[PDB]
Coordinates of C-alpha atoms and ligand atoms in Angstrom, one line a residue:
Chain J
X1 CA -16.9 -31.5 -88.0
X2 CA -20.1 -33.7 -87.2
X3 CA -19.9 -37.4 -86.9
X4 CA -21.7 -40.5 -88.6
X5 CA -22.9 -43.5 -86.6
X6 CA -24.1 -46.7 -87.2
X7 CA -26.8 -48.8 -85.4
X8 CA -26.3 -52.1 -85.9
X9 CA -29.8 -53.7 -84.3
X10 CA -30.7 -56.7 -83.5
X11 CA -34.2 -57.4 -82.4
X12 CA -38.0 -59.1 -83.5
X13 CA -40.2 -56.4 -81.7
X14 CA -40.0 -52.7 -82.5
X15 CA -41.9 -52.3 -79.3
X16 CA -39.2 -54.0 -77.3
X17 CA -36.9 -52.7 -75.0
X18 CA -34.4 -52.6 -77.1
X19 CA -36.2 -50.7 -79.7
X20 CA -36.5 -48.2 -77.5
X21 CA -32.7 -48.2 -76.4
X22 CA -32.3 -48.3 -80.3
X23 CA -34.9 -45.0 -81.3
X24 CA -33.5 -43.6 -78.0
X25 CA -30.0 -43.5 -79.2
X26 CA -31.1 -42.2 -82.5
X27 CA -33.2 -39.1 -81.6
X28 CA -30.3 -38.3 -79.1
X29 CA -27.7 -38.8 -81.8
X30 CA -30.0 -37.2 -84.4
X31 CA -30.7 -33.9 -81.8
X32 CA -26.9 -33.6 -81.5
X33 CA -26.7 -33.0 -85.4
X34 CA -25.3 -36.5 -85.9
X35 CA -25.4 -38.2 -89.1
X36 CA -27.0 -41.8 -88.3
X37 CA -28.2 -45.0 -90.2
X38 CA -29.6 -47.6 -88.9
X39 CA -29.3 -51.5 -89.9
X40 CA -32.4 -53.1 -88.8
X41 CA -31.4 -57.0 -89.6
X42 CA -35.0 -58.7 -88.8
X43 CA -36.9 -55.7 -90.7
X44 CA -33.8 -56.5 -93.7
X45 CA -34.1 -60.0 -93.7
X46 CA -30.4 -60.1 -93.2
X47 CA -29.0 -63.4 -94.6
X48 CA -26.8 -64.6 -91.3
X49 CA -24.9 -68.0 -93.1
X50 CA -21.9 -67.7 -94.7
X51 CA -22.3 -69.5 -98.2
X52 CA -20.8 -70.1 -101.9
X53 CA -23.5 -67.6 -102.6
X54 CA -21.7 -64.3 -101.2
X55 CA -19.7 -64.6 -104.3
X56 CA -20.4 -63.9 -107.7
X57 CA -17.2 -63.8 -109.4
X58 CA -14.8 -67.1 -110.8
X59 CA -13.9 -68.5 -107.4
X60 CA -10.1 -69.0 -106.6
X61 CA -10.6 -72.5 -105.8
X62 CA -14.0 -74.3 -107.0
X63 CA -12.8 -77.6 -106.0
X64 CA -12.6 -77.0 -102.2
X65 CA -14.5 -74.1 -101.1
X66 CA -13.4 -71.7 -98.6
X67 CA -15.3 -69.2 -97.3
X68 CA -12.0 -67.0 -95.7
X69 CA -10.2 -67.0 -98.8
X70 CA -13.1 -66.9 -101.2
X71 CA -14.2 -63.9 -99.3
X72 CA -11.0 -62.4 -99.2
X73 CA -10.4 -62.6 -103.0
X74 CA -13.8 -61.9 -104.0
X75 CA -13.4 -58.3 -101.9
X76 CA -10.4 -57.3 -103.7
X77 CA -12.1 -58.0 -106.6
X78 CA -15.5 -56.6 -106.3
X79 CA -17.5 -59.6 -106.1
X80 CA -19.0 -59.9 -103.2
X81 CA -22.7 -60.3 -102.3
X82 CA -24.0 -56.4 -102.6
X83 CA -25.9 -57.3 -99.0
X84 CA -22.5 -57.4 -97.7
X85 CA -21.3 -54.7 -99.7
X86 CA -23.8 -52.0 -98.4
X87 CA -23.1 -52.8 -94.8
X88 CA -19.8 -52.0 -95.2
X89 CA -20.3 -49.2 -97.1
X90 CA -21.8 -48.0 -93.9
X91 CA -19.4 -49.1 -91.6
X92 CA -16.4 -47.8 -93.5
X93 CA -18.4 -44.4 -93.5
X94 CA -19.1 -44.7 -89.4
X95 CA -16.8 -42.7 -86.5
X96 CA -19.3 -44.7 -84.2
X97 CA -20.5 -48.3 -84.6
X98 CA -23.5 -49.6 -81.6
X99 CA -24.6 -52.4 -81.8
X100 CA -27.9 -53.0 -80.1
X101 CA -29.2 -56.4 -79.1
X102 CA -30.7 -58.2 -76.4
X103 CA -28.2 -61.3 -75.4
X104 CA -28.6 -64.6 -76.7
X105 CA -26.9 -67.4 -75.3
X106 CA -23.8 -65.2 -73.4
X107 CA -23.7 -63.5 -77.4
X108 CA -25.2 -61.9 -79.9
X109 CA -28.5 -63.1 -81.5
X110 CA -27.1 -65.5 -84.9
X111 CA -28.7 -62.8 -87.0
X112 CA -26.0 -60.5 -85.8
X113 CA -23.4 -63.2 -85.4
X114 CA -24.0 -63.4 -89.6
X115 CA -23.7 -59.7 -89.8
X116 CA -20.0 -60.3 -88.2
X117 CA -19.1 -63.1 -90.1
X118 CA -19.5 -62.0 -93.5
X119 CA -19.6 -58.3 -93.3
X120 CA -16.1 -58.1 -91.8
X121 CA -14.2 -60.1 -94.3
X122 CA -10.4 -60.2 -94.8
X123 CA -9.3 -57.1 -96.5
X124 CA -11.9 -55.0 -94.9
X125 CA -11.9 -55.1 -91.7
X126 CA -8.7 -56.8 -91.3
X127 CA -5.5 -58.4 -92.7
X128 CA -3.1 -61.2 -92.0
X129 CA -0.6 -59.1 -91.1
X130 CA -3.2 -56.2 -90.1
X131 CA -5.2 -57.3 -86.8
X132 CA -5.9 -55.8 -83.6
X133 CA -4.1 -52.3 -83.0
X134 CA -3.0 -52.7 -86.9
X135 CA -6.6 -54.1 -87.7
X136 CA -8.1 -52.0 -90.9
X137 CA -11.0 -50.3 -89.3
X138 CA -8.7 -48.3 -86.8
X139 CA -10.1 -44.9 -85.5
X140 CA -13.6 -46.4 -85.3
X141 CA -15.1 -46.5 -82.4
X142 CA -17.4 -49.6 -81.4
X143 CA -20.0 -49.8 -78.9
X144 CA -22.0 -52.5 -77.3
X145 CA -25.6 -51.7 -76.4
X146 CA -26.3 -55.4 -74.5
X147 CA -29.7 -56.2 -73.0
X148 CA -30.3 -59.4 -70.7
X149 CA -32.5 -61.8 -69.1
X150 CA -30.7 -62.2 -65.7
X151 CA -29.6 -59.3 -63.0
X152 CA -26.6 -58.1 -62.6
X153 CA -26.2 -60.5 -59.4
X154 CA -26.3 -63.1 -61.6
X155 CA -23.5 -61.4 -63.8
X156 CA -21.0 -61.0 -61.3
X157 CA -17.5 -63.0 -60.5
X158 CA -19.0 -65.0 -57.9
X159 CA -22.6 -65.0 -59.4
X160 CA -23.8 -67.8 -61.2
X161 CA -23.2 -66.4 -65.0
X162 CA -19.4 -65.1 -63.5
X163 CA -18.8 -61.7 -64.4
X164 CA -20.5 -59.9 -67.1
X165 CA -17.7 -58.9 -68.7
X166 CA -16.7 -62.4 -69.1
X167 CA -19.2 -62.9 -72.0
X168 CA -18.2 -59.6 -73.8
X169 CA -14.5 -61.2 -74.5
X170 CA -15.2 -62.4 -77.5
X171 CA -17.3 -59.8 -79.3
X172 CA -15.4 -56.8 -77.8
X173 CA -11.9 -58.4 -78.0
X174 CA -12.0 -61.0 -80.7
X175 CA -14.1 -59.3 -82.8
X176 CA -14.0 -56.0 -82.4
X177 CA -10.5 -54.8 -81.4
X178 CA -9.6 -57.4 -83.7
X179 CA -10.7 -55.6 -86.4
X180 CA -8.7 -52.2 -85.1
X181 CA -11.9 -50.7 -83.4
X182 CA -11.5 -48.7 -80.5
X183 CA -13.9 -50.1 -77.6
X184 CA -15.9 -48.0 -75.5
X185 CA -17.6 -48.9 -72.3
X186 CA -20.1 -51.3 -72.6
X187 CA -23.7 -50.3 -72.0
X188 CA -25.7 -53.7 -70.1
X189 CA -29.5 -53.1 -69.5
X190 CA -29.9 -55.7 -67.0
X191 CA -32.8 -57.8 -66.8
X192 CA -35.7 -55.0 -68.4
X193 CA -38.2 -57.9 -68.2
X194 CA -37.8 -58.2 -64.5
X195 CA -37.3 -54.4 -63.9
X196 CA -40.5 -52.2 -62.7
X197 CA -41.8 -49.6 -65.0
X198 CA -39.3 -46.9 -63.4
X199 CA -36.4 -48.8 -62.9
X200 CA -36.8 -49.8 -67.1
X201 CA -37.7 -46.0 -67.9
X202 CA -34.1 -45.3 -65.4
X203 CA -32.0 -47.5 -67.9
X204 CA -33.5 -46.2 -71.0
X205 CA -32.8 -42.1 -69.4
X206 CA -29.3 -43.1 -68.4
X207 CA -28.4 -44.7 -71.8
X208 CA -29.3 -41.3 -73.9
X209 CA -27.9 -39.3 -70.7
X210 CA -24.9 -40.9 -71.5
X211 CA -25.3 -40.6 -75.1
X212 CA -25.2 -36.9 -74.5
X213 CA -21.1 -37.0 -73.6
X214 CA -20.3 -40.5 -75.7
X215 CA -18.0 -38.3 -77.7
X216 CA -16.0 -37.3 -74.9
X217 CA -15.6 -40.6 -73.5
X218 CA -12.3 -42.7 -73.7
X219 CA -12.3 -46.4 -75.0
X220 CA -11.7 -49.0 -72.4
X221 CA -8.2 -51.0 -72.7
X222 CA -9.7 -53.8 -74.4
X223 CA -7.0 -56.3 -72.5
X224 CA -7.3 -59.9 -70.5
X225 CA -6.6 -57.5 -67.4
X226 CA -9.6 -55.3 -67.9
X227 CA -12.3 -58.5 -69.1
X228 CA -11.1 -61.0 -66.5
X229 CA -8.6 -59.1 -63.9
X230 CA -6.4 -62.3 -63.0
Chain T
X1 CA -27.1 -100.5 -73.8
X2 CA -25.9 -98.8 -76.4
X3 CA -25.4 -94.9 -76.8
X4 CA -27.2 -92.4 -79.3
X5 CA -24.2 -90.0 -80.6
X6 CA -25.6 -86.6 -82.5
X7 CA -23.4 -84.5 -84.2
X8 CA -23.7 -80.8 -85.2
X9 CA -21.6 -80.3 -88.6
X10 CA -21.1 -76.6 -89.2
X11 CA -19.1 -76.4 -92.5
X12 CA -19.7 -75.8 -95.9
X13 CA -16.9 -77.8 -97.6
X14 CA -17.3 -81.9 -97.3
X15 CA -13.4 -82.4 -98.4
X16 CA -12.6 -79.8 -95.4
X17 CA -10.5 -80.7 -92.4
X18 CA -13.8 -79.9 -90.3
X19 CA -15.4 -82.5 -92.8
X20 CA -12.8 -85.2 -92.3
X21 CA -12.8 -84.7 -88.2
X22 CA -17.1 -85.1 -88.5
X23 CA -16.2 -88.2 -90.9
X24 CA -13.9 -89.9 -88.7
X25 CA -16.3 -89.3 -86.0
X26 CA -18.7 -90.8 -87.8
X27 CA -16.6 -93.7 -88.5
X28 CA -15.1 -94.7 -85.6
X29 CA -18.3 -94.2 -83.7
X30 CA -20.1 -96.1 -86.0
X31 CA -17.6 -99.0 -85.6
X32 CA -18.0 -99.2 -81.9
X33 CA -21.6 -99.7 -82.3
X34 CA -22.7 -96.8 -81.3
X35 CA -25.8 -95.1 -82.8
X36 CA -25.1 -92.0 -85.1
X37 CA -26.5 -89.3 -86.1
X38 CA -25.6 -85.7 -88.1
X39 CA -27.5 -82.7 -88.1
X40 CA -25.2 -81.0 -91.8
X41 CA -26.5 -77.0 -91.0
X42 CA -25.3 -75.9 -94.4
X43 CA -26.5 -79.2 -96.3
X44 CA -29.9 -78.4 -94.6
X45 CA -29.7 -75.0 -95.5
X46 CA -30.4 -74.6 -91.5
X47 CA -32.5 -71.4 -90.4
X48 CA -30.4 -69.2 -88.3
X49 CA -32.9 -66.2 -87.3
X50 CA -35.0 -66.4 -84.6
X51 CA -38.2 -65.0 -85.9
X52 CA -41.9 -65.5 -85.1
X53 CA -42.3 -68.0 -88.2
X54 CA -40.9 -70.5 -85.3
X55 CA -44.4 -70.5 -84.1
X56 CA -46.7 -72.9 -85.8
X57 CA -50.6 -71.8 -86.0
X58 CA -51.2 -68.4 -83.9
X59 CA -49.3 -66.5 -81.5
X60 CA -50.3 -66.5 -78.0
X61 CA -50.0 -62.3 -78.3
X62 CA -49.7 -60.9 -82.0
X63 CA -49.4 -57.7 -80.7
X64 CA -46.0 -57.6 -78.9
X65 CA -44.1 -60.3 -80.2
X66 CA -41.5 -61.8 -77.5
X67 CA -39.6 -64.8 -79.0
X68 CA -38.5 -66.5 -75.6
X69 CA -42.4 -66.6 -74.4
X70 CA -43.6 -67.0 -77.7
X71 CA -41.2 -70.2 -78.3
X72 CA -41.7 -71.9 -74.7
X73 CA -45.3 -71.4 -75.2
X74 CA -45.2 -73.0 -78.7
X75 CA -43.1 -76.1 -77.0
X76 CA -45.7 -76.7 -73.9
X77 CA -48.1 -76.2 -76.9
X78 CA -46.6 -78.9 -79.4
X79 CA -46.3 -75.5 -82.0
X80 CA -43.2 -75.0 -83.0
X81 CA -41.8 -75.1 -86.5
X82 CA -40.8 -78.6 -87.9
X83 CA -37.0 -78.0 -88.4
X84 CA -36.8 -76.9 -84.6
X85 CA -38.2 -80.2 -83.3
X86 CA -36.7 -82.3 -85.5
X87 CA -33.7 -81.5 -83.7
X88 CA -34.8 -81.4 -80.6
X89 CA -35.8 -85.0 -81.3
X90 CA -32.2 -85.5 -81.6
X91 CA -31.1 -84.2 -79.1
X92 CA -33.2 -85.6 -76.7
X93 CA -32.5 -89.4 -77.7
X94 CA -28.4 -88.4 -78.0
X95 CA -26.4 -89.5 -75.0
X96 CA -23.6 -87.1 -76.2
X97 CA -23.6 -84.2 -78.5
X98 CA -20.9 -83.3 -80.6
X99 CA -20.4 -80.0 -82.1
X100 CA -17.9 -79.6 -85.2
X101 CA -17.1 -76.3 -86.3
X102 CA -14.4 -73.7 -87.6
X103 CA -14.0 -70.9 -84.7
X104 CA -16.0 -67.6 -86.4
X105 CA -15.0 -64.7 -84.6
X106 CA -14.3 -66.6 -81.1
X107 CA -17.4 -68.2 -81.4
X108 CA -19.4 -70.4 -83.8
X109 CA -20.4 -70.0 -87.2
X110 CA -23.7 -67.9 -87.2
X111 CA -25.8 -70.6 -89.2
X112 CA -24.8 -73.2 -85.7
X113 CA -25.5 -69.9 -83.2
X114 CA -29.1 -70.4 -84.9
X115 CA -29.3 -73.6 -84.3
X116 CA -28.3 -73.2 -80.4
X117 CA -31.0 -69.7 -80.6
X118 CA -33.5 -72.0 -82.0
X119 CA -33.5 -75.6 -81.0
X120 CA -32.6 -75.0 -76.7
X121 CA -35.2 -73.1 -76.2
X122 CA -37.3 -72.4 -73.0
X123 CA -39.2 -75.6 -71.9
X124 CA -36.9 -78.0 -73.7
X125 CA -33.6 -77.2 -72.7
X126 CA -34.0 -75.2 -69.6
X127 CA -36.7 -73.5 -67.8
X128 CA -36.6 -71.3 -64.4
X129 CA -37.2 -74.0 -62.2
X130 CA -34.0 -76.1 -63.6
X131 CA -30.8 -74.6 -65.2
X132 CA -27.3 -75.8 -64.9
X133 CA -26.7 -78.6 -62.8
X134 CA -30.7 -79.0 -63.0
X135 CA -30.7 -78.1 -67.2
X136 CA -33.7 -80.2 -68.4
X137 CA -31.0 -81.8 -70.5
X138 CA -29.4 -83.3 -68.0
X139 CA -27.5 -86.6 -67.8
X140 CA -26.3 -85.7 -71.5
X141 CA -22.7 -85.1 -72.6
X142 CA -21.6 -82.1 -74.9
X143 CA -18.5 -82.0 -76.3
X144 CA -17.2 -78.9 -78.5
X145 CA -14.2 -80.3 -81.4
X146 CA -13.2 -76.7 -83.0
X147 CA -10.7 -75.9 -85.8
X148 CA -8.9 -72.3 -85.3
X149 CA -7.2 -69.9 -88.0
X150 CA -4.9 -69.1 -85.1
X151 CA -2.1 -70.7 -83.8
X152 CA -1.8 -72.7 -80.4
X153 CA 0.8 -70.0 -79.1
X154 CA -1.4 -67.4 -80.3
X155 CA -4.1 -68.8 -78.1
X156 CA -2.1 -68.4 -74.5
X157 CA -3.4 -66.3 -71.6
X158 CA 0.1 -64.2 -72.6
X159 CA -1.0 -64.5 -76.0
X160 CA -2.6 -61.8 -78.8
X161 CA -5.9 -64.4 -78.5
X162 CA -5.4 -64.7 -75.3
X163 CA -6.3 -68.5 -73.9
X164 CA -8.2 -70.3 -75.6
X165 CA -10.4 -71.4 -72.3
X166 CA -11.3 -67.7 -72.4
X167 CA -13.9 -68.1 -75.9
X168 CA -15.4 -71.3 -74.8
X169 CA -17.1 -69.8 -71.3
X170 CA -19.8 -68.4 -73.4
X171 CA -20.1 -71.7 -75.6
X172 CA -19.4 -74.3 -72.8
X173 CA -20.7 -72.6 -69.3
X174 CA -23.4 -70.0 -71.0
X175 CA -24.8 -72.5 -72.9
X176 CA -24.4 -75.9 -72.7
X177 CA -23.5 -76.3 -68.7
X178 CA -27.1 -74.0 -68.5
X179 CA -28.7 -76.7 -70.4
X180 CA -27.6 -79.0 -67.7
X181 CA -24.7 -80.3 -70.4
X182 CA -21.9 -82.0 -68.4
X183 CA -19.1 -81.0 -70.4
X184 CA -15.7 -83.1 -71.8
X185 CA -13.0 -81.7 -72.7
X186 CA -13.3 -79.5 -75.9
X187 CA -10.9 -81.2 -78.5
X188 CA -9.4 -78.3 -80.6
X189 CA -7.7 -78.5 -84.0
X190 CA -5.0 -75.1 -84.1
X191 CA -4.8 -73.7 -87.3
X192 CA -4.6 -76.8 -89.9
X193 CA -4.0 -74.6 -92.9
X194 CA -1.1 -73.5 -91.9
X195 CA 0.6 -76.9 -90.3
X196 CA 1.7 -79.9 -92.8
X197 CA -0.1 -82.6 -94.5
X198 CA 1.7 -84.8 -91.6
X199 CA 0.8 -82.4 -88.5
X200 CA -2.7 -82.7 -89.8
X201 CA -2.8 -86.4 -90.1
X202 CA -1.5 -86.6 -86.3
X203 CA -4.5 -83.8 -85.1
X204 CA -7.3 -86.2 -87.0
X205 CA -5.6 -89.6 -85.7
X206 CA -5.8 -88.2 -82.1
X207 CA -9.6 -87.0 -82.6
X208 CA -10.3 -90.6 -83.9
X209 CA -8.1 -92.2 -81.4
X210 CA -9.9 -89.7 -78.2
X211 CA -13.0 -91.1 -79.9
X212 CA -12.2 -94.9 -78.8
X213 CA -12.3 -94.0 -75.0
X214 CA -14.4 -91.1 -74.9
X215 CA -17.5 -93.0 -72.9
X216 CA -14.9 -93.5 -70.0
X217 CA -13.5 -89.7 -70.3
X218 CA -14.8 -87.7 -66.8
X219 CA -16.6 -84.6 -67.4
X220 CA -14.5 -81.1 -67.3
X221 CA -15.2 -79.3 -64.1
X222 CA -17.2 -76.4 -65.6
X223 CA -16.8 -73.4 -63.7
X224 CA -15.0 -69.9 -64.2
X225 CA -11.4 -71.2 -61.8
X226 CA -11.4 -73.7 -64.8
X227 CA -11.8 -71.2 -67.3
X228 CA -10.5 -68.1 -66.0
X229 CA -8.4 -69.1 -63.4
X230 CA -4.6 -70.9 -62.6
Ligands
LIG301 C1 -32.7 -67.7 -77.6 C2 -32.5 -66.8 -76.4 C3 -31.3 -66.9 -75.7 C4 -31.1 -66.1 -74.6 N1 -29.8 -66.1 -73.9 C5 -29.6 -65.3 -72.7 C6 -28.3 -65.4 -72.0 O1 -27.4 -66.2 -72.4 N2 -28.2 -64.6 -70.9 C7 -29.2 -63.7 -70.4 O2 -29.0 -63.0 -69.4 N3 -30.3 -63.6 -71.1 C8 -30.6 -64.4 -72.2 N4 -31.8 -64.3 -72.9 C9 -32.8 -63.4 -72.4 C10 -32.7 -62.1 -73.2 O3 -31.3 -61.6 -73.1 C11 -33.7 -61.1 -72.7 O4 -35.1 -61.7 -72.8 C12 -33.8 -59.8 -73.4 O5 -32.5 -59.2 -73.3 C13 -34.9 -58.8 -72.9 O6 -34.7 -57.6 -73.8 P1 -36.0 -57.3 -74.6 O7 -35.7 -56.1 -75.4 O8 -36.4 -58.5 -75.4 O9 -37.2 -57.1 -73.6 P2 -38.8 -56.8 -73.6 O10 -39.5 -57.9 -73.2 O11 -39.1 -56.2 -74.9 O12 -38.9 -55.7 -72.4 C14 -39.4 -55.9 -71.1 C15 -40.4 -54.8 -70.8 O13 -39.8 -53.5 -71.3 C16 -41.0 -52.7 -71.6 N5 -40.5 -51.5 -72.3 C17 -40.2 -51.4 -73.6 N6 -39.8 -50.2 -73.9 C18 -39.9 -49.5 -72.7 C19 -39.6 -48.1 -72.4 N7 -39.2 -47.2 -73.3 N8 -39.8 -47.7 -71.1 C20 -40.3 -48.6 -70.2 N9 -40.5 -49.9 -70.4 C21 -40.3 -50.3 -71.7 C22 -41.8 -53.7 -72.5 O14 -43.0 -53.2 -73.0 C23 -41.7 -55.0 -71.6 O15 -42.8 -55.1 -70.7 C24 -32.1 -65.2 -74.1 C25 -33.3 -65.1 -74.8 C26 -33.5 -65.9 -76.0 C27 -34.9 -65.8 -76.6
LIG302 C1 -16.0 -65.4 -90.9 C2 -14.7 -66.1 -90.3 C3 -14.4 -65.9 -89.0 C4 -13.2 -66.5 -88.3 N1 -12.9 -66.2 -87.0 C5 -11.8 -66.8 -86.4 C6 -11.4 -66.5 -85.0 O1 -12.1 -65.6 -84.3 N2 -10.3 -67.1 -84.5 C7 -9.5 -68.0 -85.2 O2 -8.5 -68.5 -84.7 N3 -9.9 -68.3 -86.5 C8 -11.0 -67.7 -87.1 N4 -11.3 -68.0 -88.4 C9 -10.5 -69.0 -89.2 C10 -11.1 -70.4 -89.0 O3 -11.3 -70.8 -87.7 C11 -10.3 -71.4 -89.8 O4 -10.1 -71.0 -91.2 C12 -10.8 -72.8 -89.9 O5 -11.0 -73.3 -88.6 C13 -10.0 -73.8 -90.7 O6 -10.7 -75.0 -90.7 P1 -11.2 -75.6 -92.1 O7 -11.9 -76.9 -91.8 O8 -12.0 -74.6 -92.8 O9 -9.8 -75.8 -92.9 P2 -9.4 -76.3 -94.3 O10 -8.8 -75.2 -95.1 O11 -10.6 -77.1 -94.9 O12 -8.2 -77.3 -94.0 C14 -6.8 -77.1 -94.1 C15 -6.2 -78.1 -95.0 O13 -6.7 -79.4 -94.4 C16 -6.7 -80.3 -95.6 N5 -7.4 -81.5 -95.2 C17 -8.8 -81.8 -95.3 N6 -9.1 -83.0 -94.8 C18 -7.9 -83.5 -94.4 C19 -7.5 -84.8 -93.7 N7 -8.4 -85.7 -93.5 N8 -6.2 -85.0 -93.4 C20 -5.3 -84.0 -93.6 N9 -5.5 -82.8 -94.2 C21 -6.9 -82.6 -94.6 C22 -7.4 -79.4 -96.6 O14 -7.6 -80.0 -97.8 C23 -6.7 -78.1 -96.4 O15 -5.6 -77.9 -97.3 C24 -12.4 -67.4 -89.1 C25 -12.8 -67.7 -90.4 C26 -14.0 -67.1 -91.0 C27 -14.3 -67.5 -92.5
LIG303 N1 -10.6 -65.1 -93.6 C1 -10.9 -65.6 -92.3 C2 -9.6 -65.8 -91.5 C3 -9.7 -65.2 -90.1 C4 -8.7 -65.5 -89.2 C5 -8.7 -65.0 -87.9 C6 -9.8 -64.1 -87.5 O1 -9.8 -63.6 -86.3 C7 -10.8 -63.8 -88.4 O2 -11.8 -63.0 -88.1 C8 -10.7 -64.3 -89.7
LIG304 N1 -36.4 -67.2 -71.5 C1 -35.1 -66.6 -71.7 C2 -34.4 -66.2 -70.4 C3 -32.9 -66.7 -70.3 C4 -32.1 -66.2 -69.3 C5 -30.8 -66.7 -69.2 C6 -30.3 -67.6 -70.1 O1 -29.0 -68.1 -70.0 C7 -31.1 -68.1 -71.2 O2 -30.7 -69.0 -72.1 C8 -32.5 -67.6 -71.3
LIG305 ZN1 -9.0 -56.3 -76.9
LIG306 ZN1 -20.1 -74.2 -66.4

């Protein structure tokens, strides 16, 4: 049995380095017989804020709007915004979710941050109860691809940006596990922009190298332990 | 002398609990004397994606597009798109910035993540040369007043959350600290839908009531021990 994966990326410039992470880890999924889709946001256009307008049906409360419960409902029901309703087509589809983007402020670029916030709505990704181990898209397995502008000195506990892992609490964590994902091992290109031409075209070889045995790697226990020790 | 008091709204709902804690801000600022201003991201229909349509005019490379060059050129250069300056306008005259927001995903809303993609950029609110302690915005207060789905308890180092401290690094230290942001307290509102009409009288009455003595309030030490640590 083959696998489907999902590249969720996040970046301007198709020349980037991350498009080249991003069309690495396709013709290495792609040679493996994989089944993958990418969701190029910039190239979609994706629409990031969460509005009255990812709704079309009666809402449950049109005196006070709330985007949770509106959400919420409007999934049961079938009236969501179809933009939202193609991505998670695609996720609910997906063994493998990467996402691939360069980091933006210790997070993801807000284009990406939209993708979260209205593609995994109540009752899709998750339910109250339904969250973290119990979260709806258990058995997935979710991948961070992250890019950055400072070195992996900087990124450490007693560098100046602390640990990198500290940053990844929140998307890996409160986001993804959240949601029932399993985590795997982040993948952090550190600093391409400051990187020499072989030491950029060593990260790019090692991420498909290690896309090679990604499906016999084990998630990473997505704990307070593992992101900040203590 | 006065203070200049700028606050970041991030909700789509006026008669929400975020909208009463901007409108008592509002208020009892006001009151004091103080200079007030609000910067409504969904009543502006705010741009979230950082895209080269930031970039007034012609692009100092239309062949590769880079958005961090391309934007701290366009700033040296007096190019950037109107709705980014006109906040950095803002910002630059506030004495204290106030963000107001419900917590997305252990972060902020995607249309505010744009707003912090877009309007600190490269030039304005940090550059190489200072970041940090030497942030070109220093000598300014930021001050983050989030609203959480989850609980208090929920939001414990022991917790399923974990603590709360552990979501703002990227907000507080990543981003605002970088800008050279000295930091107060972040004032957080745990999850007013589910606590009474009372409970949420008492969590808006101590926001306004902080409010009175916030100008003699000492900036939070910053750093991962205060984050992180015991
Ligand atoms: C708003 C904003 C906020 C930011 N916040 C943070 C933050 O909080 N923390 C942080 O650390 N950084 C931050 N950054 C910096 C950001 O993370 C980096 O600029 C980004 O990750 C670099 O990745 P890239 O793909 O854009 O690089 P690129 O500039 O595209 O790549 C650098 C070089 O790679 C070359 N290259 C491309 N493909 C290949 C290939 N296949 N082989 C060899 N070379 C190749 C390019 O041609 C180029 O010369 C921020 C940037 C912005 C704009
Ligand atoms: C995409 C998305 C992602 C999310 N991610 C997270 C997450 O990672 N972690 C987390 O903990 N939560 C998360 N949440 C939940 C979110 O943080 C809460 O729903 C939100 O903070 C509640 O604030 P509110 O202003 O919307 O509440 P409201 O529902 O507007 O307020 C609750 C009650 O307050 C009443 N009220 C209004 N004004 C007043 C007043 N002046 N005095 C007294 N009562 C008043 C209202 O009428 C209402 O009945 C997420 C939500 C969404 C939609
Ligand atoms: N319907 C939004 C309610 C909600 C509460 C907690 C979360 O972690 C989350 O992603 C969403
Ligand atoms: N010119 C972007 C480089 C950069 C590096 C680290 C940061 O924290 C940041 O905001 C920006
Ligand atoms: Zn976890
Ligand atoms: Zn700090």
């Amino acid at each position: 049995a083959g696998k489907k994966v999902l590249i969720v990326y996040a970046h301007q410039e198709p020349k980037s380095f991350n498009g080249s992470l991003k069309n690495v880890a396709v013709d290495e999924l792609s040679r493996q017989g994989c089944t993958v889709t990418v969701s190029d946001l910039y190239a979609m256009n994706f629409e990031p804020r969460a509005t009255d307008k990812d709704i079309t049906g009666t809402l449950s409360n049109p005196e006070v709007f709330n985007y949770g419960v509106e959400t919420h409902e409007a999934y049961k029901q079938r009236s969501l915004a179809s933009d939202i309703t193609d991505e998670q087509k695609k996720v609910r589809e997906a063994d493998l979710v990467i996402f691939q983007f360069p980091l933006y402020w210790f997070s993801v670029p807000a284009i990406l941050k939209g993708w979260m916030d209205r593609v995994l709505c109540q009752g899709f990704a998750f339910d109250i109860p339904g969250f973290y181990d119990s979260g709806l898209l258990q058995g997935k397995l979710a991948l961070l691809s992250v890019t950055t502008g400072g070195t992996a000195e900087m990124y450490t506990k007693t560098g100046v940006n602390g640990d990198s892992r500290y940053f990844l609490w929140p998307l890996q964590h409160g986001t993804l596990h959240f949601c029932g994902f399993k985590v795997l091992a982040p993948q952090i290109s550190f600093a391409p922009e400051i990187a020499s031409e072989e030491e950029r075209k060593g990260m790019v070889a090692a991420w498909s190298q290690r896309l090679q045995t990604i499906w016999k790697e084990e998630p990473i226990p997505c704990t307070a332990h593992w992101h900040f020790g203590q």
